[PDB]
Amino acid sequence: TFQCELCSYTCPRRSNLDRHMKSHTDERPHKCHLCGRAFRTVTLLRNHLNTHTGTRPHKCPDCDMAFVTSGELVRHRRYKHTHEKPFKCSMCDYASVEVS
DNA sequence: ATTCTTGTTTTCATATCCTAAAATTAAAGGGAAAATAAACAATACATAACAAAACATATAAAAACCACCTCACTAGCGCCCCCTGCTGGCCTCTGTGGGCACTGCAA
Ligand SMILES: [Zn+2]
Ligand SMILES: [Zn+2]
Ligand SMILES: [Zn+2]
Ligand SMILES: [Zn+2]
């Protein structure tokens, strides 16, 4: 029912349309007090500051290294600890942690 | 002298009036059965008052619904070796090409 004007975005929640309009309008009100980089939400700026300094809270349960976000630890476990490999190739027997 | 009209009392007469006995007839008096009316008492209907039940409003009491925030997942593109195999000179060690001095044989 809900439709977009800038693109063919179709959702059922008005709040989803609101966020999509915020993405089109690029409301970035969160700057970094070290570099000119800016973001739209607080968690992005929090991770950016957790990269300018070493304050990595997501610790690896199987080794002693760490990362700022969860997805990086997910893929680290699928590379090094639980070799998942969901996506597989066409001809060869290849598979890896990322679609890239 | 004889004949003829006219006015007035006498007396029958015929209608009327009065009188009384019958009859009679309607009034009127009383006995009694209907009979309408009326005085009183009873029943039913209608009206008013009191009390309660039903209806409507306010309010707040959980409670339901909607929207926003947030903490992750899902894509995304570099990023960075890393390993592995071919490629294109490079160089030096065998190996291809040659000039020429040297020898053994038999004149
Ligand atoms: Zn759009
Ligand atoms: Zn910064
Ligand atoms: Zn680890
Ligand atoms: Zn393949």
Q: How far is the CA of A25 from the C1' of B27 (A)?
A: 140
Q: What is the DSSP string of A18-54?
A: HHHHHHHHT---EE-SSSS-EESSHHHHHHHHHHHTT
Residues 70-89 of A with CB under 7 A from strand B: 70-71, 74
Neighbours of A96 (CB within 10 A): 16
Q: A77: CA distance to ligand 3 center in Å?
A: 6
Written as one letter, the residue type at A70 is S
**Nucleotides of strand B lying closer than 7 angstroms to a protein CB:** 67-79
Q: Which nucleotide is nearest to A13 (CA to C1')?
A: B67
Written as one letter, the residue type at A77 is R
Structure tokens at A98: 């990322």
Give backbone dihedrals phi and psi of A11, rounded to 5 degrees, phi first.
Answer: -135, 170
Q: What is the resolution of this structure in A?
A: 6.5
Give backbone dihedrals phi and psi of A3, rounded to 5 degrees, phi first.
Answer: -130, 155
Neighbours of A45 (CB within 10 A): 19
User: Residues A66, A71, A74, A80: is their CA dihedral positive or negative?
Assistant: negative
Written as one letter, the residue type at A34 is L
Inter-residue contact A69 to A47 (CB < 8 Å): yes
d(CA A84, CA A38): 35
